[PDB]
Design a protein around this ligand. Structure first.
Ligand SMILES: Cc1cc2nc3c(=O)[nH]c(=O)nc-3n(C[C@H](O)[C@H](O)[C@H](O)COP(=O)(O)OP(=O)(O)OC[C@H]3O[C@@H](n4cnc5c(N)ncnc54)[C@H](O)[C@@H]3O)c2cc1C
Ligand SMILES: Cc1cc2nc3c(=O)[nH]c(=O)nc-3n(C[C@H](O)[C@H](O)[C@H](O)COP(=O)(O)OP(=O)(O)OC[C@H]3O[C@@H](n4cnc5c(N)ncnc54)[C@H](O)[C@@H]3O)c2cc1C
Ligand SMILES: Cc1cc2nc3c(=O)[nH]c(=O)nc-3n(C[C@H](O)[C@H](O)[C@H](O)COP(=O)(O)OP(=O)(O)OC[C@H]3O[C@@H](n4cnc5c(N)ncnc54)[C@H](O)[C@@H]3O)c2cc1C
Ligand SMILES: Cc1cc2nc3c(=O)[nH]c(=O)nc-3n(C[C@H](O)[C@H](O)[C@H](O)COP(=O)(O)OP(=O)(O)OC[C@H]3O[C@@H](n4cnc5c(N)ncnc54)[C@H](O)[C@@H]3O)c2cc1C
Lengths: 113, 387, 386, 387, 388
């Protein structure tokens, strides 16, 4: 869906601070130092620590599901539940109308802009 | 009970890892290693770190104790990146298999254990300069002398031949030529740093060039008696039992390559225009791609069938030799056509298909040639009908 | 889960019945029926009794309600005995399929129901003197004309054409030649003794001679609006939809005959001697035998796969066209090969293989020729790369 | 010298006669004779009249004294009409050849002359139920009893077997099983109405249905020693030597069948439309016709090669067996493909291709099987290299 | 005339022995070094020129021998048996020369054919482009007439002898209107390699025929004198087309030379290597393979002979040359892989002759018109006999 909303939105409902698009993370006790990727470069933040952080590309290189551990993970547990339980609705005043397909230098810097 | 062509979720996650490593780490350097013919160490160590090697080794030796089916789905993925590197790490199951199927409890925790601890290679040495297909014309002699044996002779075309910690070794036990093959040969576990052993220079072949292959000369090589596999004369059964569990994996290798050939030819056919149209709009090219797709899909199932039969406890000689003969064959057919569709570019050394043609030819020769596969299938077939 | 290549215990039961029927009852008379070419009415009825026919009809309508994978099982066993016989039987599933997948409960209870209660036949009418492979080329006209349509035109090569109770018919219901396949064809069920329906002479083909294949014309044939399949102009979608669940089975037919070819050839090589040796002991003949084995095993898996795909919920189009394409070709290779092994005898009518060769050519033609199959596969394949 | 692929002017007109005949007189009745199995006596007599039969018979017996190349080009034009009717005409030259090459002047003027005088048939007799391919395994007894031999046994599959004035018969004289083929069998000429000769019924084959093909039984049959060909135990050479001059014309038969199937598929593909285009505008149909026309053209040169070789004093064996193998294989390939191009019409009896496919199959079998043709080629070939 | 003959002229038996002696005494001994290194085999090319086995189509009045297409095929088969890389480098000359032979004037022929007579210069056929090979009519290299010259702008791809050539035959787009047909859109030039504007690219690295140089060439403002245009403006596509009648058979002879080498190798070896107690040739399957391989070669040989005989007779031979190049190329690949196969593991190994033959052969189904293209031509020729 290319959204970029859930992290932010979760952080709002808990009223916790959000550290969006993180390139780096540290605990400084009951505070998180969060580097984040903004348009010009990297801004740094500090957050009181119930917190919400959304991983950006830069943050890390994810690891491989190691064959041994794929097996070991078949043991570990997974509680399976409903949204109805947690006390959440679901009904949605959004609706998709459609999903189509994509289709001098004075003109050109104009047609990039 | 019931036919199923769907993987376990465990196998899916295996395939996904195998495939992440194949596309991400093998492919981007596979031409580089084919060009230099250098043994691909960093990748073998990575694959070992990921748990993708020595997959048959049982749990009580610190192994994963996984099926023939799992090896096959894994190794199709590695092959798709490169059959040179897939063959390298396949050499281990080959050398290991006899010990897994024929070794005692100390033999097993000794030679299998170490594979669990570091990434060491092993190889299977049977072929000699005078015999490959006719395994029963092996003439490397092995004499009992007290508490041990004296191995004398020369082995050819051995994968990991210069890279192995240890060898499965098959050698002629009995001088009597009236001796039945089935009881004429002994099979050993033979550490590679034994005195007498002379590994040769790297063999330069047309294909799978980064894989290590070489001749070995054994002179007066002392093998401790408690590394004999089952007994004297026992080797021939042992060596032959191995294939059940390894032939499917070689076939699965071939489809890997065929699949690669198919994707490379299908991408190009969607870019290149001739006479104002994409190549896919040329019925002859579609016909070609269809047939490649047919051959791959059946090749795939065939190795899937052989892997399932042995995993079910049954023996699979018929099905496995079907899979190798067909896979071998269609890997080659698919390599050339991929070259052909790419055209002039396909014949060039910076496009990725030319390597596949060169890599592919091996699959009609090692691990049993296209001819001796058909004798095996014919023999199993005929036997179903006689009293 | 995991992969499995084992039949279910109940499937083995089906297979067992089908094998025993084919070898005990079909084989003994298959050659007479090939010589004479008369429609094998006993064995049909008999197949009907043993439950090896109309396997697709849901229990809803007193059918046995089995999948495509079961229909393939049985069809291979029947075909091993005879593809003429086995074709006439599959003729009925061809006819049923469009109603099975696209009828309402009335249409199903009515036209599938009756098949349950007695061994009635039925046929699939699409091919025409001018179009076969190109289904959007059919010209047979249906004009809406009240609470009913009027059918005009000529179909051709209809299995069971002259032995059927009713027909799936497909006709050009939009006269504007610019209209698409999707909107231009309506598909009907059509009772055979409807006035206008003129059934032709029996056609005389190379093979599957006991099969009833014939032409049939329609002159102002009236068909009630109650018998339209999904609605006006859904004929194409419908006719097309049948193929997923029929082609796998046509391929099992091909595999059956392949198996038979190979069995005959192998028996003969084990007992015939030349240059002092059983034919088996010549490396050439061995290699032949082995290559044929290969082909069969592979052809069988291909169909088993397509069937499972469709029984599992999903479209099997790519898979079913691969199985058809390959089973059909290797059937023709096996049969001429099997003739080759028997030598002079092989070319002779008093031996069983010569028949196989004449039977097997059809499997590269009907239900979509080898070439059309390949277009489909290319299409399915290629679309996966954009 | 210099290569040439142009006919003599005579050869060109011989071709026209045979083509006039086949297209006017054979073609419009061929399917009728196929449907019925009636031995086509009007056409044989007609072919005899036009000098298109017994063409190998020397001049000094009143035959045309033509060469193998001539007989080949005639034989193609005939086969194109029908291989049922031309196999019956060729039968004659098969019966006549072992007398042409190995008979004495008496033998020739008597048994060849009558062929020259009226439309008689003769036949060739070697095959038995027990053997066809393995000629050195024939068991028909030929014992020296007087100024004669007594002939006991059974021949099977004999073209014109029920229609011949006389037979070339091959039977095993030396009863010591330890004797070579070289010395073991005798060739004979045998008047058909000799007593002791019981001719069985017309066998029914898939194809060449108008050709007459049957078994002959030989109960105590008395043959004059005069009807021996050169002497005792020389029968194998004579029957082997016949093939140089016959194997080429069989190949030319195959090609005629091939050329017919090509034309029919071409004529049709230029009239049938599908998906808006003519068949011929679908690249795959184009490629089939193109692979077909390649195949006919190469088989023709091959039989032409082998005719020329022998017509010029040379031994044929390699070039004749190549052309026999190849013409045979491709006729079968051409017939299915022609049935294929015509679709459902192809499969049906009202069209000319269904016949072609059933006719085409004996070409892999008789006058030497496909398999043994390769044993011959193999052999001739390996022999240029044995130093 | 007289009937058929498959007998060489005495004179042609003499050409045959010379090419063979060369191929066998001089090429064979060194082809695997030149294949291993990609080194352009200058001695052998000079030695083949010396011996008059090169530029043989050149007519006598330009200093050549004016040999036919049959003669040229004999000789190539012989060279190709030794090495296809070498023979391709020799052969390129004929391809470059051919449009000048068939379409050049007296000043053009004398000047540019004639110089080939007195030194072993090379020339090249400059057609294929990054974007078009099979579809000749898709080439876009520009030629605009500006003065009594033309100015060539374009890039060329896969040019055999491309960086070794005294001059080039070059095909270029003369007509800017893209709607302009192939019969009007193109003009063929003779271009001297040392013209300013011409930049020879790097040696391109292929699977096979590695000693042959094949190269990209870029033309940047290249000045071409009006007198080096072939028949005139817009004749380019016919002139390039016409070169093929005389050349297809010879590349077919090349494929046959390599085919025959493969056979001879695999036969020699199957008469010394034994398995299971017997020699390879006593195993039936191997024997059958050698047999089918021998068929394949004999038939290919006749096929190209027939093509060559047709054009020497003053007939256009499109149909027959296309069967040759289709059949010869398909079977050269077939024979190569079998030869490997029969040598088992050794065959896959680089110290044995055959793997190379397998790497060498694939190009025969690509260049001088793909396998598929040849079938389109054969189809078109075949079907026209039936349109009335
Ligand atoms: C890259 C590579 C890696 C290898 N790795 C190993 C390895 O790690 N371990 C190992 O033990 N070996 C290995 N080998 C050797 C390989 O297994 C053998 O080459 C193969 O078994 C074929 O044997 P051969 O080369 O001796 O050929 P041969 O046995 O001489 O066979 C020659 C040819 O004749 C055919 N032939 C032989 N006998 C018959 C017959 N009975 N009937 C019909 N045809 C016959 C063969 O199919 C082949 O085409 C490797 C080989 C290669 C090329
Ligand atoms: C014994 C028999 C029984 C039959 N029974 C039935 C039945 O009961 N019900 C029914 O509806 N039909 C039936 N048919 C019809 C059968 O399915 C058709 O013959 C088949 O679909 C092919 O169509 P066609 O004969 O019109 O050939 P065509 O469509 O004319 O095909 C001619 C040739 O051209 C090729 N071709 C056609 N279009 C293309 C193109 N797109 N691109 C490349 N190649 C192309 C074909 O592959 C073929 O080789 C039967 C046919 C037979 C022979
Ligand atoms: C229409 C017809 C007309 C005939 N007319 C005549 C005639 O007029 N005169 C006459 O003498 N005969 C005639 N024959 C007989 C015919 O020539 C034989 O059928 C033929 O020689 C093949 O021999 P077979 O039938 O005994 O096959 P078999 O010898 O039993 O062989 C059967 C199969 O095994 C194969 N095979 C046998 N040996 C080997 C081997 N060592 N290695 C590999 N493969 C092997 C064969 O190729 C064949 O595929 C005719 C046959 C037919 C069908
Ligand atoms: C080693 C080498 C040397 C060469 N030397 C020369 C030389 O010196 N001079 C020169 O001019 N060129 C030379 N070439 C170029 C060569 O001739 C071309 O590569 C060839 O003619 C066609 O190549 P392509 O790469 O453009 O094929 P593409 O046009 O990219 O075709 C790719 C594939 O599509 C298929 N295809 C394309 N169009 C159709 C269609 N309409 N219908 C069916 N199939 C189709 C082709 O068969 C082929 O398999 C050389 C090439 C090589 C590899």
């Amino acid at each position: 869906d290319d959204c970029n909303q859930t992290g932010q939105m979760t952080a709002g409902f808990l009223d916790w601070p959000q550290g969006t698009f993180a390139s780096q993370v540290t605990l400084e006790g009951d505070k998180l130092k969060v580097e984040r990727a903004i348009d010009g470069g990297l801004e740094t933040l500090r957050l009181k620590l119930p917190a919400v952080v959304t991983a950006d590309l830069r943050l890390n290189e994810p690891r491989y599901a190691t064959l041994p551990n794929i097996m070991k993970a078949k043991k570990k547990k997974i509680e399976v539940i409903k949204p109805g339980d947690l006390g959440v609705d679901l009904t949605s005043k959004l609706s998709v109308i459609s999903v189509e397909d994509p289709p001098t230098t004075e003109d050109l810097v104009a047609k990039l802009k | 009970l019931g036919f199923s062509f769907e993987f376990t979720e465990q196998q899916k996650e295996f395939q996904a890892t195998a495939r992440k490593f194949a596309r991400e780490e093998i492919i981007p350097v596979a031409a580089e290693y084919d060009k230099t013919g250098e043994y691909p160490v960093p990748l073998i160590r990575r694959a070992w770190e990921l748990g993708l090697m020595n997959t048959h080794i049982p749990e009580n030796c610190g192994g994963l104790g996984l099926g023939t089916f799992d090896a096959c789905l894994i190794s199709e993925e590695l092959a798709y990146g490169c059959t040179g590197v897939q063959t390298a790490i396949e050499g281990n199951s080959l050398g290991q298999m006899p010990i897994i199927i024929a070794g005692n409890d100390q033999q097993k925790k000794k030679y299998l254990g170490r594979m669990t601890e570091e990434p060491l290679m092993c190889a299977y040495c049977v072929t000699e300069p005078g015999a490959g297909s006719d395994v029963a014309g092996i003439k490397t002699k092995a004499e009992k002398k007290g508490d041990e044996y004296i191995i004398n002779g020369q082995k050819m075309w051995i994968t990991n031949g210069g890279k192995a910690n240890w060898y499965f070794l098959l050698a002629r036990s009995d001088p009597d030529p009236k001796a039945p093959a089935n009881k004429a040969f002994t099979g050993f576990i033979v550490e590679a740093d034994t005195p007498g052993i002379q590994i040769g220079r790297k063999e330069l072949n047309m294909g799978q060039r980064c894989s290590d292959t070489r001749g070995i000369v054994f002179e007066d090589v002392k093998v401790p008696k408690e590394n004999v596999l089952i007994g004297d004369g026992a080797g021939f059964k042992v060596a032959m039992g191995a294939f059940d569990k390894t032939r499917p994996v070689v076939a699965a290798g071939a489809v890997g390559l065929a699949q690669r050939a198919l994707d490379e030819a299908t991408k190009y056919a969607l870019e290149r225009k001739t006479f104002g149209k994409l190549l896919v709009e040329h019925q002859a090219i579609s016909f070609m791609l269809a047939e490649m797709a047919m051959k791959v899909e059946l090749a795939r199932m065939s190795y899937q069938r052989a892997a399932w039969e042995v995993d079910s406890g049954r023996r699979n000689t018929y099905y496995a030799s079907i899979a190798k003969a067909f896979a071998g064959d269609i890997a080659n057919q698919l390599a050339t056509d991929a070259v052909q569709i790419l055209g002039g570019n396909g014949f060039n050394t910076e496009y990725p298909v030319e390597k596949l043609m060169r890599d592919a030819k091996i699959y009609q020769i090692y691990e049993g040639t296209s001819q001796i596969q058909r004798l095996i299938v014919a023999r199993e077939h005929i036997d179903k009908y006689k009293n």
